[PDB]
RNA sequence: AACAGUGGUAGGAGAGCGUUCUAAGGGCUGUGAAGCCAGACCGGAAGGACUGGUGGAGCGCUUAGAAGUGAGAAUGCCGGU
RNA sequence: GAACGAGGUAGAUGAAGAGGUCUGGAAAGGCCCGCCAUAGGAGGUAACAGCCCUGUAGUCAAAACUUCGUUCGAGUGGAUCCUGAGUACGGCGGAACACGUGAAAUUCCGUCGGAAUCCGGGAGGACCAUCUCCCAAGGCUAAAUACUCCCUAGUGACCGAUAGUGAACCAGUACCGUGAGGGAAAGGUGAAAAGCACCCCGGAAGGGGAGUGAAAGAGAUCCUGAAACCGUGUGCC
């Protein structure tokens, strides 16, 4: 899973293009990532435990990792992900630059 | 046969008049039919198998009486009319190959080679040597030969500069002169030889 | 308890006669113990019997 | 021959005379094997040379066979394959093998006498027919007996 | 072109249709395929398309090759009625 | 008995476009362009992907357990003795040899007056001599070869749920049988549970709206949904 929770994720395709944002949650066993803004469905809820207002709730649905790419911290550009070692721990390395994270 | 010749760069150089014993026979189109169905046959492993009435894990009992009752005869719970079923005949493991006589397979190669002399999809390229195994150099050669389709290269003794290259190119496969594949010469439809392999063809036929 | 010509000796099998309380008892070498030459070389040890015509003539 | 246009010589391929599919083609119901015979059932039937109970032909004839161990298949030369050679050459059974004259030396090379020669030859071999001994001398050739 | 013949069971002989899979070419598909559903189209026949409606992802042709090769009857198997 | 080298039991690294557009719920598709390659096997992601993701080519990785492979008594005699003891050999019992006892060798595997032993013995399809071959009656012995329950890797003019393992699913179960045993049936919502809040009808069950989703006839044995069959209407009789 080449993307860390809390990055600057850019959405490739799907029902919404264009929008970028941050990860709110992840599901690596199911290969799905919950990102703010995108894939927001209007969900029905019954007036049950955890605030029985019922109504139509509003939240986002998780997106598969293949729509997710991080942007360049040097240019603001959708770049691919490599790997280097800088004094100890392996770090993520964005392509098209010598950038990290 | 007066087949032309080019350079590794692709520039026009001195040609080679080939040998009529190998490249100047008439095309024997009846042999080429029965040539390829030999080689196509022994590319199939044919390892298909179906459990018969015996290898069926059951069967056995007369499932009820034979008289006194109402049904048909129906004499084992796994006969072929039944739903669980042993297939009646089915396919069994076997081979498909058969070794044609040597005078056929000599003539079968030569008629294809003599055809491509007429078909002009054949270019002798001496000394195909490369620094790296990079297919970008290989792609530059092919567009320098105006080949936008399938192609074949006959090396002398499987030069690894050619051999490690071009396995990534879809339409081009690499083969040496010891491995002149009767399907692939017909299949790839355009053909390249090194000059050392030209006599290596001629020394065996 | 043997010889060298057919496979039947002091071994392990069956019998069911009566009066009926039971375990292991014997088939032994059926001796009556004297010379031969089918091998004429002596110690005068055991014999058993499946058939005894044409052992020899004399 | 292109892969798009594969075709045989007409007469070298021939479709199946496949048996038992519909009455339209024929061979439908009975499947070529008639009405209710013993020669129609599942493999039951007859040996090849069997006559229904009448004494079959291989027994009512006597036995006139006897085979010795010590037989010799002599190599058979019609004396005319030596006309493939020129005169004055060597004629040995080791030479007749690799020249394609005799494909198998079965312990003995006898030379028959049908035909004629015109070539003086150094002929040595195991046995000779009587007319072949004179026919080699008729061409002046020598008739050594190995 | 002319002349002649063409009912057929068992039975021999010759031509073709079609499904599955592969093989080179070609193409045709989210601007809707395969299937399914209908008709008044064509081919001598097995048949083959062409619009229309369903369906929501693949499949035809041309020539070849391989066959578990095509149903309406087994006091047939297995469901549904 | 120790050291090295290679392999295995977890791995890592890894090239090059959200290219622009057009439809569409959704681009990986079409169109117009690029680019990488010792990587255009394969899977995954809203549909068909060399460059979207896991990864594949190539190269490295082992604390520890291992696996394979490397390194630290000859000759010549010719007095005597020995050279396989309770068995080797045949024509009338049996069995294995292709051989059914025959002309029946031979090998053994139960049994009827106890041969030689180197000047010897056995065999060469009865036997006899000659002739060549060989010392039986003690034991050990790798490779080539027979095979698959698992494992690793990967093939297919193999099957696609009545097919293929009986068993794609809690299957050797459920059930039948005291019993040894016999032995089934049954996969598919979408790309995402976003799976129907809310309003009515009824005790619900179940709908009709609404809302969700591109589709709700897609809504819970949930894709396509034929025929039997059950129908509701109506044109002509």
Tab-separated table of N, CA and C (backbone and C1' of nucleotides) in Angstrom, chain C residues 2-3 5-6 34-43 47-48 50-51 53 56 58, chain F residues 85-95 108-116 137:
chain	number	residue	atom	x	y	z
C	2	UNK	N	12.880	-77.985	8.261
C	2	UNK	CA	12.789	-77.591	6.857
C	2	UNK	C	13.596	-78.544	5.976
C	3	UNK	N	13.630	-78.218	4.677
C	3	UNK	CA	14.552	-78.729	3.658
C	3	UNK	C	14.703	-77.649	2.602
C	5	UNK	N	13.086	-77.858	-0.956
C	5	UNK	CA	12.382	-78.127	-2.216
C	5	UNK	C	10.916	-77.599	-2.315
C	6	UNK	N	10.042	-77.478	-1.289
C	6	UNK	CA	8.779	-76.746	-1.554
C	6	UNK	C	8.274	-75.991	-0.316
C	34	UNK	N	15.330	-90.839	7.197
C	34	UNK	CA	16.374	-91.660	6.578
C	34	UNK	C	16.890	-90.971	5.310
C	35	UNK	N	18.015	-91.485	4.792
C	35	UNK	CA	18.809	-91.027	3.649
C	35	UNK	C	17.981	-90.716	2.413
C	36	UNK	N	18.463	-89.770	1.603
C	36	UNK	CA	18.194	-89.744	0.171
C	36	UNK	C	19.455	-89.436	-0.606
C	37	UNK	N	19.398	-89.696	-1.908
C	37	UNK	CA	20.057	-88.813	-2.853
C	37	UNK	C	18.961	-88.401	-3.841
C	38	UNK	N	18.209	-87.388	-3.434
C	38	UNK	CA	18.083	-86.223	-4.287
C	38	UNK	C	19.239	-85.309	-3.896
C	39	UNK	N	19.743	-85.492	-2.671
C	39	UNK	CA	21.030	-84.979	-2.206
C	39	UNK	C	21.659	-86.007	-1.274
C	40	UNK	N	22.705	-86.689	-1.736
C	40	UNK	CA	23.258	-87.787	-0.959
C	40	UNK	C	24.253	-87.420	0.115
C	41	UNK	N	23.940	-86.405	0.929
C	41	UNK	CA	24.947	-85.811	1.807
C	41	UNK	C	24.368	-85.619	3.211
C	42	UNK	N	24.923	-86.294	4.222
C	42	UNK	CA	24.157	-86.669	5.420
C	42	UNK	C	24.257	-85.756	6.635
C	43	UNK	N	23.181	-85.769	7.434
C	43	UNK	CA	23.257	-85.788	8.897
C	43	UNK	C	22.140	-86.637	9.508
C	47	UNK	N	12.177	-84.523	7.919
C	47	UNK	CA	11.445	-84.852	6.693
C	47	UNK	C	10.007	-84.367	6.903
C	48	UNK	N	9.334	-83.919	5.835
C	48	UNK	CA	7.868	-83.771	5.855
C	48	UNK	C	7.322	-84.280	4.521
C	50	UNK	N	4.175	-83.930	1.503
C	50	UNK	CA	3.088	-83.540	0.602
C	50	UNK	C	2.691	-84.660	-0.348
C	51	UNK	N	3.679	-85.390	-0.860
C	51	UNK	CA	3.501	-86.477	-1.812
C	51	UNK	C	4.794	-87.266	-1.817
C	53	UNK	N	5.249	-90.251	-4.193
C	53	UNK	CA	5.669	-91.074	-5.316
C	53	UNK	C	6.647	-90.261	-6.140
C	56	UNK	N	12.417	-90.726	-5.550
C	56	UNK	CA	13.287	-91.451	-6.479
C	56	UNK	C	12.612	-92.785	-6.781
C	58	UNK	N	14.694	-95.904	-6.219
C	58	UNK	CA	15.349	-96.851	-5.331
C	58	UNK	C	15.899	-96.190	-4.066
F	85	A	P	31.043	-76.512	3.392
F	85	A	O5'	29.584	-76.356	4.010
F	85	A	C5'	28.432	-76.715	3.258
F	85	A	C4'	27.668	-77.857	3.886
F	85	A	C3'	27.949	-78.127	5.364
F	85	A	O3'	26.747	-78.568	6.002
F	85	A	C1'	28.378	-80.074	4.110
F	86	G	P	25.485	-77.580	6.178
F	86	G	O5'	24.519	-77.983	4.975
F	86	G	C5'	23.376	-78.805	5.194
F	86	G	C4'	23.547	-80.177	4.588
F	86	G	C3'	22.502	-81.201	5.003
F	86	G	O3'	22.352	-82.175	3.972
F	86	G	C1'	24.628	-81.839	5.848
F	87	U	P	21.006	-82.233	3.100
F	87	U	O5'	21.218	-81.119	1.985
F	87	U	C5'	20.476	-79.903	2.003
F	87	U	C4'	21.006	-78.881	1.018
F	87	U	C3'	20.858	-79.232	-0.468
F	87	U	O3'	20.701	-78.023	-1.221
F	87	U	C1'	23.115	-78.917	0.022
F	88	A	P	20.122	-78.044	-2.727
F	88	A	O5'	21.426	-78.008	-3.643
F	88	A	C5'	21.433	-78.618	-4.926
F	88	A	C4'	22.723	-78.362	-5.666
F	88	A	C3'	22.924	-79.195	-6.920
F	88	A	O3'	22.278	-78.624	-8.038
F	88	A	C1'	24.885	-79.275	-5.602
F	89	C	P	21.386	-79.532	-9.009
F	89	C	O5'	22.459	-80.334	-9.863
F	89	C	C5'	22.210	-80.670	-11.218
F	89	C	C4'	22.469	-82.132	-11.467
F	89	C	C3'	21.294	-83.063	-11.224
F	89	C	O3'	20.415	-83.119	-12.325
F	89	C	C1'	23.232	-83.938	-10.188
F	90	G	P	18.944	-82.487	-12.224
F	90	G	O5'	18.097	-83.360	-13.257
F	90	G	C5'	18.607	-83.655	-14.553
F	90	G	C4'	18.910	-85.125	-14.718
F	90	G	C3'	17.703	-86.051	-14.695
F	90	G	O3'	17.205	-86.226	-16.013
F	90	G	C1'	19.419	-86.867	-13.231
F	91	G	P	15.643	-86.425	-16.325
F	91	G	O5'	15.508	-87.992	-16.594
F	91	G	C5'	14.533	-88.516	-17.490
F	91	G	C4'	13.915	-89.778	-16.941
F	91	G	C3'	12.663	-89.574	-16.094
F	91	G	O3'	11.469	-89.496	-16.859
F	91	G	C1'	14.219	-90.896	-14.889
F	92	C	P	10.279	-88.509	-16.412
F	92	C	O5'	9.124	-89.493	-15.922
F	92	C	C5'	8.308	-89.180	-14.800
F	92	C	C4'	7.935	-90.426	-14.036
F	92	C	C3'	7.301	-90.217	-12.665
F	92	C	O3'	5.908	-89.938	-12.723
F	92	C	C1'	9.045	-91.803	-12.484
F	93	G	P	5.137	-89.270	-11.472
F	93	G	O5'	6.116	-88.127	-10.957
F	93	G	C5'	5.610	-86.869	-10.538
F	93	G	C4'	5.193	-86.871	-9.087
F	93	G	C3'	4.351	-85.679	-8.664
F	93	G	O3'	2.977	-85.853	-8.951
F	93	G	C1'	6.094	-86.022	-7.090
F	94	G	P	2.111	-84.630	-9.511
F	94	G	O5'	2.752	-83.360	-8.804
F	94	G	C5'	2.699	-82.084	-9.413
F	94	G	C4'	3.019	-81.012	-8.413
F	94	G	C3'	3.294	-79.633	-8.977
F	94	G	O3'	2.110	-78.925	-9.282
F	94	G	C1'	4.909	-80.169	-7.338
F	95	A	P	2.073	-77.876	-10.496
F	95	A	O5'	3.043	-76.708	-10.037
F	95	A	C5'	2.650	-75.783	-9.040
F	95	A	C4'	3.790	-74.871	-8.689
F	95	A	C3'	4.341	-74.050	-9.841
F	95	A	O3'	3.597	-72.873	-10.080
F	95	A	C1'	6.121	-75.107	-8.725
F	108	C	P	19.669	-73.592	-7.656
F	108	C	O5'	18.444	-74.148	-6.805
F	108	C	C5'	18.201	-73.691	-5.483
F	108	C	C4'	16.978	-72.816	-5.445
F	108	C	C3'	15.740	-73.408	-4.800
F	108	C	O3'	15.698	-73.552	-3.377
F	108	C	C1'	15.115	-72.533	-6.864
F	109	C	P	16.100	-72.396	-2.333
F	109	C	O5'	15.103	-72.616	-1.103
F	109	C	C5'	14.199	-73.718	-1.034
F	109	C	C4'	12.806	-73.332	-1.466
F	109	C	C3'	11.668	-74.346	-1.289
F	109	C	O3'	11.040	-74.381	-0.001
F	109	C	C1'	11.637	-73.499	-3.500
F	110	G	P	11.476	-75.344	1.234
F	110	G	O5'	11.185	-76.878	0.835
F	110	G	C5'	11.419	-77.942	1.773
F	110	G	C4'	10.228	-78.828	2.081
F	110	G	C3'	10.494	-80.256	2.547
F	110	G	O3'	10.988	-80.295	3.885
F	110	G	C1'	8.644	-80.204	1.070
F	111	U	P	11.324	-81.631	4.752
F	111	U	O5'	10.884	-82.920	3.917
F	111	U	C5'	11.808	-83.681	3.150
F	111	U	C4'	11.109	-84.844	2.495
F	111	U	C3'	11.950	-85.983	1.944
F	111	U	O3'	12.469	-86.876	2.912
F	111	U	C1'	10.299	-85.432	0.385
F	112	C	P	13.678	-87.858	2.519
F	112	C	O5'	13.035	-89.317	2.426
F	112	C	C5'	13.812	-90.477	2.712
F	112	C	C4'	13.247	-91.720	2.061
F	112	C	C3'	14.196	-92.491	1.135
F	112	C	O3'	15.087	-93.415	1.766
F	112	C	C1'	12.267	-91.965	-0.062
F	113	G	P	16.236	-94.146	0.884
F	113	G	O5'	17.560	-94.171	1.788
F	113	G	C5'	17.724	-95.110	2.847
F	113	G	C4'	18.830	-96.126	2.608
F	113	G	C3'	20.256	-95.599	2.436
F	113	G	O3'	20.898	-95.308	3.679
F	113	G	C1'	19.769	-97.142	0.713
F	114	G	P	22.503	-95.158	3.875
F	114	G	O5'	23.070	-94.219	2.704
F	114	G	C5'	24.454	-93.841	2.751
F	114	G	C4'	24.890	-92.772	1.763
F	114	G	C3'	26.203	-92.090	2.125
F	114	G	O3'	27.023	-91.723	0.996
F	114	G	C1'	24.387	-90.528	2.272
F	115	A	P	26.587	-91.855	-0.552
F	115	A	O5'	27.958	-91.609	-1.325
F	115	A	C5'	28.566	-90.331	-1.440
F	115	A	C4'	29.269	-90.225	-2.771
F	115	A	C3'	30.590	-89.470	-2.821
F	115	A	O3'	31.700	-90.215	-2.354
F	115	A	C1'	29.234	-88.756	-4.598
F	116	A	P	32.919	-89.472	-1.611
F	116	A	O5'	33.591	-88.573	-2.742
F	116	A	C5'	34.418	-89.146	-3.744
F	116	A	C4'	34.605	-88.198	-4.899
F	116	A	C3'	35.648	-87.107	-4.714
F	116	A	O3'	36.964	-87.548	-5.005
F	116	A	C1'	33.649	-86.150	-5.519
F	137	A	P	28.002	-69.869	-3.972
F	137	A	O5'	27.336	-70.958	-3.025
F	137	A	C5'	25.939	-71.195	-3.069
F	137	A	C4'	25.582	-72.487	-2.387
F	137	A	C3'	26.256	-72.733	-1.050
F	137	A	O3'	25.593	-72.076	0.012
F	137	A	C1'	26.443	-74.665	-2.389
